[PDB]
Design a binder for this molecule. Structure first.
Ligand SMILES: CCCCCCCCCCCCCCCC(=O)O
Ligand SMILES: CCCCCCCCCCCCCCCC(=O)O
Ligand SMILES: CCCCCCCCCCCCCCCC(=O)O
Ligand SMILES: CCCCCCCCCCCCCCCC(=O)O
Ligand SMILES: CCCCCCCCCCCCCCCC(=O)O
Ligand SMILES: CCCCCCCCCCCCCCCC(=O)O
Ligand SMILES: CCCCCCCCCCCCCCCC(=O)O
Ligand SMILES: CCCCCCCCCCCCCCCC(=O)O
Ligand SMILES: CCCCCCCCCCCCCCCC(=O)O
Ligand SMILES: CCCCCCCCCCCCCCCC(=O)O
Ligand SMILES: CCCCCCCCCCCCCCCC(=O)O
Ligand SMILES: CCCCCCCCCCCCCCCC(=O)O
Lengths: 347, 347, 347
């Protein structure tokens, strides 16, 4: 009970502690905030999962988070946002995916130089988008990370002498799918892989650890992540996608995030909003394959562009339904507290 | 006189009728609203023209409109907008152009499955765009349809095992144009074809029927549609476009819409605004060829992206001219009533 | 002292002169406003530099500026903006770069026809963006020019029978860089070339003349332009860019503009804002190579898209630092007056 939720008691106790422990807590919260989790223990679990997948990726992500938090402190950003990990969760993804999309293999120490540089731009993006989106009461999601990674991967490319990137080839021929070779076990295993591919990790154990951390933060968030991954798998099956792409979790890491965001987190949790979150996850998977095909023509991966776009689209949409409630941005903590607040406001 | 204009008397009489007749009226108005027409009889005429061109395309468009209206009703959207056909006119285009850009020929019944799915997203897009564009008092035009069709055609592509799309090849060699083979009769005939290509129909009879329906709704709108198609033809001739592209109406279906919108419809009709509409039609044709060339590099058709972009750009532009008047979004019915309202407000 | 700054005395004396002299002054100010300079004498110097580089390019730019100013007068835009050259500085770039990116060589008189047409659309863009951006207190920069040039170059392309454009080939193989062949003299000479490539001119004498004109307007702006060009060169060296691209000034014409804008011009000049301008110049160079690589896949040059995007991103970003001050849009004249106003407001 002490480690569940956002761990407000730990933050209150650390508010008067030496700044080193506070900085460590901020780094852990920023690591956890990729899946909309404000738990430092969930951040430790996510770090353990990243180390299980690849220690080099974990090192790059931790370095990116540290550099982003330090730069946000240097830029005199809001201290409340920095304490909650909202300044540094984009750079974790930036560093991890820069290590993922590198063509020079593991432990390429020179890659530590661009990573920091891009981690130097994550706060600025996070600032510049926020002051706009907070005008319309909308979150930035992973838009700063998407912009930074697209800019970096366009600047370097596959043929960069210093930091070559993994080549992205657009689909040229019609795939041949043997539907008799579809494996139910692999389809079931792609759900943890789908959840784990949020950090670009294809290890089923890493995805299971991520799901466990999310469940530690909030069981409803873990359930919505699993359902979003399953819906991404279903959308991939509906479009006759290659089985290797479905088994790799490339179809479920956007829909899982969309289901987490639209289910309980930024909309009050009701069965109507549950169905809306399911529909948003399906739409997010379809937009994900569309964006992947579109940016494959320019040599870029879609990453989490479809998730941000679809979630913003569904959040901006307005309905004359009292049971479909959009939570205020200042009261969004986690689905249980969000539902309690919505029930209190309803009466 | 009873069937001209928006047919407000029919709506008033149907407001207390059984909901089946009201739903039929809403579907007809949504069909007609592609060309900014709120006339159910014009919707019937447009359906007849679509059947003349291709019954399969008409069936897909009708199914898309019905599904979009039902989904907008399910989402508790504004009943006034649904009654006027503003929730369902984008899905008509979505279904018709999904049938048009299909590589599996006519009467591919499986294509009825994705169409409905895309018609499920047309209301949401509209809503998500409306709440964004109503702040600055701007219409959504066919932006939801453009976004939905771009996402669908990127997701499927030409090499999809289930729903392949027609291949789009960027221009590779310089065209050889024999200017002695230019036909005045074909140039004149491309005006109805350019008007009918709004629905993706290249039949001159279909375009003539569409022009007749628009004239039934409003003569000024039909005149502006014809002038916009002619201006698109002129712009195509100015850039040495292939004659087959001009004869197919691919150059005049965006400028015609731009001239309809900017002439009398969303700006008060004056000779100054008439010249502004002509300039907007020329700019829209040039932006149309530019956007088509740009999106051919990613394997996508431009469709009505240039029309929406150019019309929004011309509507946002502000001048210190009293005779260049932008009609309020709540008072926009059709050019005759718009001009009457503008004359009343001027005095 | 009479010709330094904006020469408000000359404007006051010309306010009651015949309109021909006023129009000439407006054209000169519009020519100079590309580098955020409101000096007609600097406009004359920039015209001299353009003539030194290429008389055809100077003729096209002058014609574009004249046409844009004439149509902005015809469109009843704000007279104060027209008098300060803010309606016509985008068409100077449009005409000059349309002459630059033409595949038909120099003195192609038919190119005078599209140029005017694009100069026709420059005021509208300048209007349409302004009303959108003045809400958030942001400048339009060269966004109208970028939009117009992208639209034109997409519409025509390399294979246009009438107005072919220079082919843009994306990078296909990894460059081989002989670092022992790097020349310090060429690196130093690329700074004036980097400043002169704002107008698409690769002549070092032209860049030196441009720097002299900027220094005549304001020494701080010239210093920031030189530092931005140097930072662009450094960023190009950091990414192992080909030496020919660095020597051609293709790496420094965006960072120089970003350093001019962010240093003293649109943000109050302090050492903190000086470091922020340096960081913005580095970010602008990296975004410039990224966007160049991105639009090379669609056959388009990036031009000044990265400069506008990065400068807007850095201007929107908000910090809780009193020394990092964003000047109001109505009081922005030049860095010396900007700093004086900021110092007066601080106390
Ligand atoms: C936006 C893309 C670029 C981001 C910033 C990249 C900065 C890299 C660090 C500069 C020096 C790198 C030297 C590496 C030499 C080598 O790889 O052998
Ligand atoms: C795909 C290659 C390009 C690089 C990736 C996109 C980088 C975008 C940087 C600028 C973001 C927008 C800044 C604010 C603009 C506005 O005024 O709305
Ligand atoms: C809106 C879509 C909802 C999800 C639909 C999931 C459908 C999964 C199965 C679709 C393809 C079934 C196999 C057909 C191919 C074959 O067996 O030859
Ligand atoms: C892209 C294909 C899938 C698109 C799915 C769009 C539909 C999402 C929302 C589903 C309906 C939710 C209705 C909730 C209110 C109610 O049930 O009364
Ligand atoms: C070409 C790639 C596929 C097609 C993608 C079309 C766009 C679909 C999603 C649009 C979401 C728009 C959200 C806007 C949010 C905002 O204005 O901040
Ligand atoms: C955004 C692109 C996708 C839009 C939604 C597509 C949903 C298709 C329906 C799912 C089942 C398809 C079965 C096809 C069977 C076949 O063609 O053999
Ligand atoms: C902005 C201008 C719009 C109107 C343009 C009208 C058409 C002019 C170009 C078409 C005629 C070209 C004739 C020369 C062809 C040739 O003989 O090679
Ligand atoms: C790219 C093709 C050229 C586009 C040029 C658009 C010009 C718009 C037309 C403006 C005409 C004048 C408007 C009324 C002013 C007046 O004459 O009193
Ligand atoms: C955005 C597209 C281009 C802008 C508009 C270009 C208008 C050109 C009008 C004149 C066309 C005919 C003159 C060229 C004749 C020739 O070169 O043979
Ligand atoms: C590659 C060809 C196209 C180049 C860019 C041309 C863009 C013309 C229209 C710009 C958008 C104007 C409307 C903006 C509306 C809004 O954002 O609210
Ligand atoms: C993040 C901004 C960095 C700006 C300064 C970067 C300076 C880079 C200097 C060149 C890098 C090394 C070149 C030689 C490498 C070799 O010989 O292989
Ligand atoms: C793309 C790589 C480079 C990115 C550079 C980002 C950092 C810009 C410079 C920020 C300096 C901040 C100075 C004010 C704070 C202070 O020192 O008091």
């Amino acid at each position: 009970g002490y480690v569940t939720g956002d761990m407000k008691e730990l933050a209150n106790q650390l508010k008067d502690k030496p700044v080193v422990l506070q900085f460590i807590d901020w780094i852990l919260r920023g690591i956890s905030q990729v899946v909309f989790v404000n738990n430092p223990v969930s951040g430790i679990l996510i770090l353990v999962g990243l180390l299980v997948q690849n220690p080099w990726w974990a090192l790059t992500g931790w370095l990116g988070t540290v550099v982003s938090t330090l730069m946000a402190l240097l830029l005199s950003q809001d201290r409340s946002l920095i304490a909650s990990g909202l300044y540094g969760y984009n750079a974790t993804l930036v560093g991890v995916l820069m290590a993922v999309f590198s063509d020079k293999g593991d432990y390429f120490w020179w890659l530590l130089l661009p990573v920091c540089a891009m981690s130097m731009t994550c706060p600025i993006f996070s600032s510049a988008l926020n002051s706009m989106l907070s005008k319309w009461d909308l979150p930035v999601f992973t838009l700063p990370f998407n912009m930074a990674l697209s800019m970096y991967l366009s600047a370097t490319g596959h043929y960069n002498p210093f930091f070559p990137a993994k080549l992205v080839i657009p689909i040229t021929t019609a795939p041949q799918i043997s539907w008799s070779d579809l494996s139910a076990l692999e389809l079931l295993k792609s759900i943890p892989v789908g959840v784990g591919q949020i950090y670009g990790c294809d290890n089923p154990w890493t995805g299971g650890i991520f799901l466990g951390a999310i469940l530690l933060s909030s069981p409803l968030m873990c359930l919505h992540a699993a359902i979003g991954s399953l819906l991404g798998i279903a959308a991939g099956l509906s479009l006759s996608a290659p089985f290797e792409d479905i088994y790799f979790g490339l179809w479920g890491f956007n829909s899982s995030l969309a289901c987490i965001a639209m289910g309980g987190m930024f909309m009050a949790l009701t069965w109507q909003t549950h169905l809306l979150a399911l529909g948003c996850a399906l739409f997010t998977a379809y937009l994900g394959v569309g964006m992947a095909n579109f940016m494959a023509e320019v040599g870029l991966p879609a990453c989490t562009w479809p998730f941000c776009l679809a979630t913003l689209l569904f959040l901006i949409m307005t309905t004359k339904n009292s049971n479909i409630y959009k939570m205020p941005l200042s009261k969004v903590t986690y689905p249980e507290e969000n539902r309690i607040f919505y029930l209190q406001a309803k009466k």
